[PDB]
Design a protein around this nucleic acid. Sequence first.
RNA 1: AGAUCUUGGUGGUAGUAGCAAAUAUUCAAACGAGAACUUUGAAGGCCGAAGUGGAGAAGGGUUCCAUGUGAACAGCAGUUGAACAUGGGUCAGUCGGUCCUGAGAGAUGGGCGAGCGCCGUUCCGAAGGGACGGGCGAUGGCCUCCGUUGCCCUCGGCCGAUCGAAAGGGAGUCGGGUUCAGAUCCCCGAAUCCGGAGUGGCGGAGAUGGGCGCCGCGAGGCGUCCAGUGCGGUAACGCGACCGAUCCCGGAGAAGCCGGCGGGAGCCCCGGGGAGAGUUCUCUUUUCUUUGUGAAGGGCAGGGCGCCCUGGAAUGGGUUCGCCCCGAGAGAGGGGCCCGUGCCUUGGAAAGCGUCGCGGUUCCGGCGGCGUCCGGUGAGCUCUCGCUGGCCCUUGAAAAUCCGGGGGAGAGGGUGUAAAUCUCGCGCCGGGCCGUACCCAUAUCCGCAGCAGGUCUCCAAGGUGAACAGCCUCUGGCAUGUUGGAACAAUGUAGGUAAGGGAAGUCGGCAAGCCGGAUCCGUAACUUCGGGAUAAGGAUUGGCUCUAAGGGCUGGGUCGGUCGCGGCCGGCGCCUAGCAGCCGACUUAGAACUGGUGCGGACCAGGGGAAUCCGACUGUUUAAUUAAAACAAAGCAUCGCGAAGGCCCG
RNA 2: AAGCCAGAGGAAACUCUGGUGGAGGUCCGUAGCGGUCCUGACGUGCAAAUCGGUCGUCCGACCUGGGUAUAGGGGCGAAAG
Lengths: 91, 149, 50, 114, 69
Amino acid sequence: AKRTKKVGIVGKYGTRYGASLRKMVKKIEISQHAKYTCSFCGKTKMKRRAVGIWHCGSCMKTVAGGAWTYNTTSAVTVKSAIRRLKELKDQ
Amino acid sequence: PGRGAPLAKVVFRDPYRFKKRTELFIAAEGIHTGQFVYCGKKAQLNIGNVLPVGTMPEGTIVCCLEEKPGDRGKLARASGNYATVISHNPETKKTRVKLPSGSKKVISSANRAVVGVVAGGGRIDKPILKAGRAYHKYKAKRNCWPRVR
Amino acid sequence: SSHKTFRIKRFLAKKQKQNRPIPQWIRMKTGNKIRYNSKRRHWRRTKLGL
Amino acid sequence: VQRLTYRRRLSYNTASNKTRLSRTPGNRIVYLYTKKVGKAPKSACGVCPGRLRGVRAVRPKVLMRLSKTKKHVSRAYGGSMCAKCVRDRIKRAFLIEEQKIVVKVLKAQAQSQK
Amino acid sequence: PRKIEEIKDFLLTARRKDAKSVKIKKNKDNVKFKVRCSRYLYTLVITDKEKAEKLKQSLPPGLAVKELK
RNA sequence: AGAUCUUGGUGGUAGUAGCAAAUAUUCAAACGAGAACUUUGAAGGCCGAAGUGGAGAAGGGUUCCAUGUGAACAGCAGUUGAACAUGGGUCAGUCGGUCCUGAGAGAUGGGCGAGCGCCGUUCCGAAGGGACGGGCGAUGGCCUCCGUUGCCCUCGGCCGAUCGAAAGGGAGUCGGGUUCAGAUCCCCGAAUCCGGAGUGGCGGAGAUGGGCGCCGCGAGGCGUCCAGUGCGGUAACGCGACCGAUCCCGGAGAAGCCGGCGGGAGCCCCGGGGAGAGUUCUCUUUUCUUUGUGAAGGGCAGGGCGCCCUGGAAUGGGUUCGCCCCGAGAGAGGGGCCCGUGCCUUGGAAAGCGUCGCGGUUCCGGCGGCGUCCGGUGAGCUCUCGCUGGCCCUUGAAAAUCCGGGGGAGAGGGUGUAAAUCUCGCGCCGGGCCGUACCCAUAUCCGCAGCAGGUCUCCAAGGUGAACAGCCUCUGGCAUGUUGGAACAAUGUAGGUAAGGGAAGUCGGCAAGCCGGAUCCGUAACUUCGGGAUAAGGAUUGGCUCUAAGGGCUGGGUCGGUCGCGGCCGGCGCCUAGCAGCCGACUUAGAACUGGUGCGGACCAGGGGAAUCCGACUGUUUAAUUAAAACAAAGCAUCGCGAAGGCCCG
RNA sequence: AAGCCAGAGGAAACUCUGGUGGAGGUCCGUAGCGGUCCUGACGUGCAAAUCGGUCGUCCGACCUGGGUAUAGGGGCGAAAG
Ligand SMILES: [Mg+2]
Ligand SMILES: [Mg+2]
Ligand SMILES: [Mg+2]
Ligand SMILES: [Mg+2]
Ligand SMILES: [Mg+2]
Ligand SMILES: [Mg+2]
Ligand SMILES: [Mg+2]
Ligand SMILES: [Mg+2]
Ligand SMILES: [Mg+2]
Ligand SMILES: [Mg+2]
Ligand SMILES: [Mg+2]
Ligand SMILES: [Mg+2]
Ligand SMILES: [Mg+2]
Ligand SMILES: [Mg+2]
Ligand SMILES: [Mg+2]
Ligand SMILES: [Mg+2]
Ligand SMILES: [Mg+2]
Ligand SMILES: [Mg+2]
Ligand SMILES: [Mg+2]
Ligand SMILES: [Mg+2]
Ligand SMILES: [Mg+2]
Ligand SMILES: [Mg+2]
Ligand SMILES: [Mg+2]
Ligand SMILES: [Mg+2]
Ligand SMILES: [Mg+2]
Ligand SMILES: [Mg+2]
Ligand SMILES: [Mg+2]
Ligand SMILES: [Mg+2]
Ligand SMILES: [Mg+2]
Ligand SMILES: [Mg+2]
Ligand SMILES: [Mg+2]
Ligand SMILES: [Mg+2]
Ligand SMILES: [Mg+2]
Ligand SMILES: [Mg+2]
Ligand SMILES: [Mg+2]
Ligand SMILES: [Mg+2]
Ligand SMILES: [Mg+2]
Ligand SMILES: [Mg+2]
Ligand SMILES: [Mg+2]
Ligand SMILES: [Mg+2]
Ligand SMILES: [Mg+2]
Ligand SMILES: [Mg+2]
Ligand SMILES: [Zn+2]
Ligand SMILES: [Zn+2]
């Protein structure tokens, strides 16, 4: 059965810290504790080890990613920009 | 401990004697274990490679920038931060870059830097929510936290 | 304590050896002026220097 | 019941003060001071997390009095690297040297024209 | 302590130069011959009795033949 | 004569205050001049395993043990003492220190400083004094040939002395006995670690085979030539060794907290068999106690494996308490490895223990008989091992030390009962120095003291119960906390009860009282939607006799068609809505009967509601009059600074 | 609390119900740590700060041994001079 109406993962914090702060930290905690699909082995075992470190259980590959998500939108745009600048630098 | 950026342990070959040299690079986001990273003037633009700023294009962004031509990385080291290579002039061998503070700095074109943004993402987005979490944060850094007005 | 160093043990040994009464024949010596050992120490009354 | 005492002057439950219960021939329970749990080697590849097989798991100074066979496996890198990663390294070495031969032949046939 | 399996090993173990003595223990089910060497006490367990007596007379001379009964 | 004068002495107070925190003593006897207090016996109690028990660290330092004394001390007493006096007592390769580094401390170089010096610890140093390797040589000498020595070549970054842990890292000792007081140290018996062996201690391994000619009836011998730094398994990996330097790589040391399971032990519990006790007014085949196997080897269970081989899976399957796992190879079959603290065995029964006896050596590790057995249980408790998760803007030492691998410089012998070499078996020698008694606390420590205070840990039985709660008890311990006797006034201190009223008392419900556990119902406003909430409110609760429900192990044959009253194949048959027998915990629900309506019967154990103010919460704070609304906090906002810098010390 | 299983309802989006799970500077409450009130005891005390009952917290900004560092106009202070 559904146990909470809206708090979800931040029900562990009780009534404390303020509704807006709990709402703010809810999405970060969800993405922090999510298990992502490893882009090397294909399994859904890539999970956070510490802040910025994402380790896959199966292939034992460790990646430097974001603090709460596996990669940041900033880093994705940066990688695309670097690829474009490389292909423009050479010919 | 004490910093939010992950550190990359990278092993090189010693060019002059039979030995393996281990470095402690600051992990640019996107690098993984088992990846080859290339350091030098003739290195290619890839995330994690180290190469002088003067050889880099007019819009690239960099991770662990040197303040002086020859020391190790000094700028844009904290997690999620990066600098941008704005402009060059081959004469006087100078490169103008933009620092995380928004300031503009002229440095030597021989300064090396890591391509990409440093890992550790938007660490400051999450509210700490707890004096205990703040205590554990600063216990790994230094005695500064409980601040009396 | 039970764990002790050799210097400490030797110090305690000397203190034990000199914490004793005077001999009886001392009081018969000529011009004695000594009635009793006035440097007697009890382990519970006064504690040692160390 | 019979309650126990330590047999040494170390009176704290530290990591070096671990005991087990033994029933002597005199029909009494006593502490026997155990040795720490040893670990098998990890693979020198540094990737796969299991520890090596065929090697006795003891404390490091016990290995000085073990025979040679008890500390390795009859294979290249035996007792230092796991078999799976030894196979991977053999294949990797062979195939990369083959690739070097291929690229040398490729540039040799490419330079046949001015 | 070391348990000797067969009689042949026990003979040369008893004939070793460091063999101090041999003790003979008669139990209800077996007879134990215990030779005291430099490092180990070697025990041979004999289930029957005629072979035990044969060993008792075949023990080498010059060695103490202590009987534990 | 004065100075709250200085020092010393002495009064009244005054035989007064007082010797009242933690339930408790009594009887007889002994010694003795003398007994409320000492000792012994009997009885009644207490601590009640989170102890008033058994042992340590720090600290003390002889307080430990025996004997004696009765001056003083032990705020009464003492025949007693932690007092006094006289003697005695602490035994180590394997228990620690010692060794290593940690936070840190600290020389030298250098820098500063009037100067004693202090800054600094890799920084402004020519910072390696070592090395099996090769050469030059001295032949020192059993001058065969290997050990010496000086120089040269080659290699050589702990890049920094040194100190820093009796709780961290750190090889390897256990069982029994023994004293007045010591024992993992002594004795007995079983082991084990490290180091050494030049003249090499013994074996074993290396390693002792093929080819060709001959001889020889064959087998087997002769000569020559050629191998030979081991071997097995498809694999995981195995076998008793298994040449190898500088150098390189890796491992172990070497890692937080919490959760949930599972294995193993110890303890607890249950049913029997012994042995000894207790009860026996009646009953009780009864109640109580006791009923061993060390280290180190070998074998086997058991646990674990992110190890291997076959094979290829959707109608997806396997599987946990939860999970989780699989074409990057599931399920299934067969293997391999690790741990093995459990069992058996050597140790080992000769010892120990329990009983029943017999001798004496004033005080025997005396001698002897018998026994030391069979089982069952489990969300039990405690340790330990393992598996798998969760949390972290927290990611939870270092170094000694030891090992494996890569590479192949070299070394070894010419086919010999061979060589170099050996992490294999056995054998020989050694392990120095210091600590070691005892207390470890309502009396051995600090607090002026035998001070209700303070002072770091280990072990942990039965009943009730959710329980390491409280209450009672066994093992162990003690004598009521520096006195006793007789009374039972006031006033007190601590604890109860109180008709009728029910806060009228008081600044104020201060204090006390009410409520309280569990089961079944039932729960509002408000809310940040999580809470409020044990809201509020109500019912039940004993004893006894039953009734249901919740499991686990085995075995299901149709048969002589026959001889290994039994075994191989098969004509020979249909539990297939599952039966047959056996064993086993607790727990839940329901019913009847029943007692003077009493039943969480002691113990344990929320009074509740409606609002206002302040602080968000959790946290902290004036040790010794203020615990708060104060401080902190997350959150918010502002400021400085790109290192020739911001802030700060000097 | 998240995560997970099953059943049911849905055109979908998804929803409802019962289990499972075991989070939290979570609650009651031992030990521990603290010290609210009685303005209790004591107040020439047991004590130059203690005692009784009642209390606050009791998985964490938790309690604590030992080793180190900071020294007087200095230290250290979740702040009371
Ligand atoms: Mg503040
Ligand atoms: Mg004292
Ligand atoms: Mg055993
Ligand atoms: Mg006068
Ligand atoms: Mg005058
Ligand atoms: Mg009086
Ligand atoms: Mg009185
Ligand atoms: Mg009692
Ligand atoms: Mg005690
Ligand atoms: Mg005494
Ligand atoms: Mg007196
Ligand atoms: Mg004395
Ligand atoms: Mg050097
Ligand atoms: Mg040292
Ligand atoms: Mg230690
Ligand atoms: Mg003793
Ligand atoms: Mg045994
Ligand atoms: Mg399988
Ligand atoms: Mg016996
Ligand atoms: Mg002792
Ligand atoms: Mg006291
Ligand atoms: Mg003093
Ligand atoms: Mg007292
Ligand atoms: Mg009393
Ligand atoms: Mg009394
Ligand atoms: Mg009344
Ligand atoms: Mg009334
Ligand atoms: Mg009134
Ligand atoms: Mg009035
Ligand atoms: Mg009140
Ligand atoms: Mg309310
Ligand atoms: Mg009834
Ligand atoms: Mg507050
Ligand atoms: Mg507020
Ligand atoms: Mg306080
Ligand atoms: Mg105060
Ligand atoms: Mg107060
Ligand atoms: Mg605000
Ligand atoms: Mg709490
Ligand atoms: Mg609480
Ligand atoms: Mg008062
Ligand atoms: Mg003020
Ligand atoms: Zn992966
Ligand atoms: Zn591997």
